[PDB]
């Protein structure tokens, strides 16, 4: 470690601890920056040399963490918890958490290489027939093909190509990750991930949320399954069984908005998918980002700085080099550089993703002057919620009309059902997936799911929660969990479930603050400076204060709560119950063992 980055002398008391934290931040920004920069260089240009550089950067970060972590303990271990300044206690708490820096050098090196190799494998996997990439090729097929055999080819090809080679690395990763956090005093990595919510009852609280949300999912599921049955036939759809996992518009069946055009309740009302209009009007990625930015500035939040536009990667590179296409937002910890990396496509769901990512950037812009350790969301679900809240306003037919993407719509009950149904495909269908992913990972980390049951337990959960089944046979050679970005890229997932509940609490609160008095799902907070001020107060707090308190100030309640989401969807929740009863649907999938057969002459789809 460079001398200028090493910790020096400080007194073993609170006053000294303040000075230690100031000294820490000065050097941490340099170390974090070099690490984020090397990660950027790799993820926008995947090569063995860039992985090597990233790995060296990670090693330096680990050296730094260890030196400052050990010094924190040397001076403050018995006293930091009784410090007067709550922000100081939080800073010291973070600094003393070493993570992978607890690993000896040889194991740090294995750990860092595993992360590189898992990232490479996922982001460069291809499906050959001249081969298709996940983004854009397989993504467009899953979104827009209504050919059972083509969808199957893409679903099978992707899961085989990405998942199988990841399995041995993922096992090695898991063991090292656990070894590292065990030395911070956590029984496994999952306990550490969960500790960020600062709640002894986290898992029970989640379960009780999902219990309230499940009926909305069951009804949406049954209604969609009926439509698929009419399209694909009794051979491939079982009206009392799980839906085949390739038919829902998304590689992971995690959100279903891309099959809206197959299930639209009232086809004679306005077309709520504005993708065609975007293309007809000549929208490009840059326009999509500018229109999102303008919504932020309408709220008197910050524009994107010049460094964002100059540094970001907003379209897939045409030199055809290898990149991580999965959308992400980047804080370089120098208070200057902030960037999005997205292989942007010109679609409505991508306009929402643009807002999701820019929500992350706005958080970074608002908390950039807090101590480095506090530059995080109040909890990670908050970070994921910000942009989605704005996107809820944007997606309203009234808002789409204002920005030229939809001829004005009537405000009749059919149009309302169409809209709420399209929104349910995006938000309600996700809920089970958002909840199950980290249930699988927590079980893997805890040892309840060994390698011998990775796929068995993954499909147990996928069926249990989503009511889906693999459309070709799978066995334990397959590692279907590895075919989802967040698994090989070690990004926790429960955040997204928390976010999907939390964003409706936020939405309600900001709509009320904007003085809006109509139905919650027709609220648009555009140009509400009062709403903007209320959101800003959250963003500026970072992780300086307990999230329960930040939430309380914002929404008047100190807990996650499903009622705002239930209120938003009420009309379509009722409509779907009634529709399914009229059709005599079974809610659920009691034929839990059912899987579809292979099509005739599959895979001869020349
Ligand atoms: C689409 O229409 C709905 C329904 O409007 C009905 O009620 C009014 C507006 C009347 O013109 C009638 O013909 C319509 O059928 C609009 O939703 C309603 O919005 C009004 C506010 O404009 C709400 O009134 C307010 O609600 C609460 C009651 O708790 C109070 O805080 C307020 O003082 C006020 O009473 C009303 O509740 C809404 N009705 C329903 C069924 O939700 C909606 O605004 C409109 N949307 C658009 C985009 O035009
Ligand atoms: C992608 O990364 C590679 C490294 O793997 C970059 O290669 C360097 O390119 C520079 C600039 O032209 C050359 O001068 C160096 O000699 C190259 N280094 C190596 C090790 O080959 C490449 O430039 C990157 N591409 C982009 C667009 O950034
Ligand atoms: C696991 O499955 C492997 C390949 O999948 C199989 O063959 C495909 C084409 C389908 O027909 C499907 O029924 C099968 O699952 C097999 O090569 C392999 O033998 C199986 N693995 C183990 C460990 O038994
Ligand atoms: Cl999380
Ligand atoms: Zn996000």
From Swiss-Prot:
One of its GO terms (cellular component) is extracellular region. Disulfide bonds join 128-131, 325-343, 511-523. Changing residue 475 to D: In Ndom123456 mutant; abolished dipeptidyl carboxypeptidase activity. The lineage of its organism: Eukaryota, Metazoa, Chordata, Craniata, Vertebrata. GO terms for molecular function: actin binding; bradykinin receptor binding; calmodulin binding; chloride ion binding; endopeptidase activity; exopeptidase activity; metallocarboxypeptidase activity; metallodipeptidase activity. Ubiquitously expressed, with highest levels in lung, kidney, heart, gastrointestinal system and prostate. The keyword Ion transport does not apply. Phosphorylated on tyrosine residues on its extracellular part, promoting cleavage by secretase enzymes and formation of the soluble form (Angiotensin-converting enzyme, soluble form). GO terms for biological process: amyloid-beta metabolic process; angiotensin maturation; angiotensin-activated signaling pathway; antigen processing and presentation of peptide antigen via MHC class I; arachidonate secretion; blood vessel diameter maintenance; blood vessel remodeling; bradykinin catabolic process. Zn(2+) 1 binds at residues 356, 360, 384. Belongs to the peptidase M2 family. The record marks 489 as: Not glycosylated. It comes from Homo sapiens (Human). This is Angiotensin-converting enzyme. It is found in: Cell membrane; Cytoplasm. Inhibitors of ACE are commonly used to treat hypertension and some types of renal and cardiac dysfunction. It is linked to Ischemic stroke: A stroke is an acute neurologic event leading to death of neural tissue of the brain and resulting in loss of motor, sensory and/or cognitive function. Ischemic strokes, resulting from vascular occlusion, is considered to be a highly complex disease consisting of a group of heterogeneous disorders with multiple genetic and environmental risk factors. Dipeptidyl carboxypeptidase that removes dipeptides from the C-terminus of a variety of circulating hormones, such as angiotensin I, bradykinin or enkephalins, thereby playing a key role in the regulation of blood pressure, electrolyte homeostasis or synaptic plasticity. Composed of two similar catalytic domains, each possessing a functional active site, with different selectivity for substrates. Keywords: Calmodulin-binding, Carboxypeptidase, Cell membrane, Cytoplasm, Disulfide bond, Glycoprotein, Hydrolase, Membrane, Metal-binding, Metalloprotease, Phosphoprotein, Protease, Repeat, Secreted, Signal, Transmembrane, Transmembrane helix, Zinc. Monomer and homodimer; homodimerizes following binding to an inhibitor. Interacts with calmodulin (CALM1, CALM2 or CALM3); interaction takes place in the cytoplasmic region and regulates phosphorylation and proteolytic cleavage. Induction: Up-regulated in failing heart. Residues 11-590 form the Peptidase M2 domain. Chloride 1 binds at residues 197, 495. Glycans are attached at residues 9, 25, 45, 82, 117, 284, 411, 475. The chain holds residues 30 to 640 of 1306 of the full protein.
């Amino acid at each position: 470690l460079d001398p200028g980055l090493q910790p020096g002398q400080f007194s073993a008391d609170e006053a000294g601890a303040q000075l230690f934290a100031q000294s820490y931040q000065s050097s941490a920004e340099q170390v974090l920056f070099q690490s984020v920069a090397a990660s950027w260089a790799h993820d926008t240009n995947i090569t063995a040399e860039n992985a090597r550089r990233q790995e060296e950067a990670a090693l330096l970060s680990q050296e730094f963490a260890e030196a400052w972590g050990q010094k924190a303990k040397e001076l403050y271990e018995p006293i930091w918890q009784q410090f007067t300044d709550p922000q100081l206690r939080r800073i010291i708490g973070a600094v003393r958490t070493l993570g992978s820096a607890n690993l000896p050098l040889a194991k740090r090196q294995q750990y860092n290489a595993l992360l590189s190799q898992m990232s490479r494998i996922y982001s460069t996997a291809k499906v050959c027939l001249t081969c298709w990439s996940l983004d854009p090729d397989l993504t467009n097929i899953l979104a827009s093909s209504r050919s059972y055999a083509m969808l199957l080819f893409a679903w099978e090809g992707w899961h085989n190509a990405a998942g199988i080679p990841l399995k041995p690395l993922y096992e090695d990763f898991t063991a090292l990750s656990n070894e590292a956090y065990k030395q911070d005093g956590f029984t496994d990595t999952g306990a550490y991930w969960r500790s960020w919510y600062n709640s002894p009852t986290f898992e029970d609280d989640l379960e009780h949320l999902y219990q309230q949300l499940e009926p909305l999912y069951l009804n949406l599921h049954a209604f969609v399954r009926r439509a698929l049955h009419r399209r694909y036939g009794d051979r491939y759809i079982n009206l009392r069984g799980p839906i085949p996992a390739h038919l829902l518009g998304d590689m992971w069946a995690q959100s279903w908005e891309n099959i809206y055009d197959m299930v639209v309740p009232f086809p004679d009302k306005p077309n709520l998918d504005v993708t065609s209009t975007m293309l007809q009007q000549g929208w490009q990625a840059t326009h999509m980002f500018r229109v999102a930015e303008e919504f932020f500035t309408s709220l008197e939040l910050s524009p994107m700085p010049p460094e964002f536009w100059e540094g970001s990667m907003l379209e897939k590179p045409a030199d055809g080099r290898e990149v991580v296409c999965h959308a992400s937002a980047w804080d370089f910890y120098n208070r200057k550089d902030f960037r999005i990396k997205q292989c942007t496509r010109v679609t409505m769901d991508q306009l929402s993703t643009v807002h999701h990512e820019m929500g992350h950037i706005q958080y970074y812009l608002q908390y950039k002057d807090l101590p480095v350790s506090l530059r995080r969301g109040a909890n990670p679900g908050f970070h994921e919620a910000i942009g989605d809240v704005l996107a809820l306003s944007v997606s309203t037919p009234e808002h789409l009309h204002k920005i030229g993407l939809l001829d004005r719509v009537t405000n009749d009950t059919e149009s309302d059902i169409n809209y709420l149904l399209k929104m349910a495909l995006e938000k309600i269908a996700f809920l089970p997936f958002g909840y199950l992913v980290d249930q699988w990972r927590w079980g893997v980390f805890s040892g309840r799911t060994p390698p011998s049951r990775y796929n068995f337990d993954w499909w147990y959960l996928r069926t249990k929660y989503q009511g889906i089944c693999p459309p070709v046979t799978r066995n334990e050679t397959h590692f279907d969990a590895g075919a989802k970005f967040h698994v090989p890229n070690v990004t926790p997932y429960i955040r997204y479930f928390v976010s999907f509940v939390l964003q409706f609490q936020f939405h309600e609160a900001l709509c009320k603050e904007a003085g809006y008095e109509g139905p919650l799902h027709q609220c648009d907070i555009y140009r509400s400076t009062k709403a903007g001020a209320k959101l800003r107060k959250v963003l500026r707090a970072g992780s300086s204060r307990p999230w329960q308190e930040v939430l309380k100030d914002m929404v008047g309640l100190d807990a996650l709560d499903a009622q705002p989401l239930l209120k938003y969807f009420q009309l379509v929740t009722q409509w779907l119950q009634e529709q399914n009863q009229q059709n005599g649907e079974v809610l659920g999938w009691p034929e839990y063992q059912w899987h579809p057969p292979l099509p005739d002459n599959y895979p001869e789809g020349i």
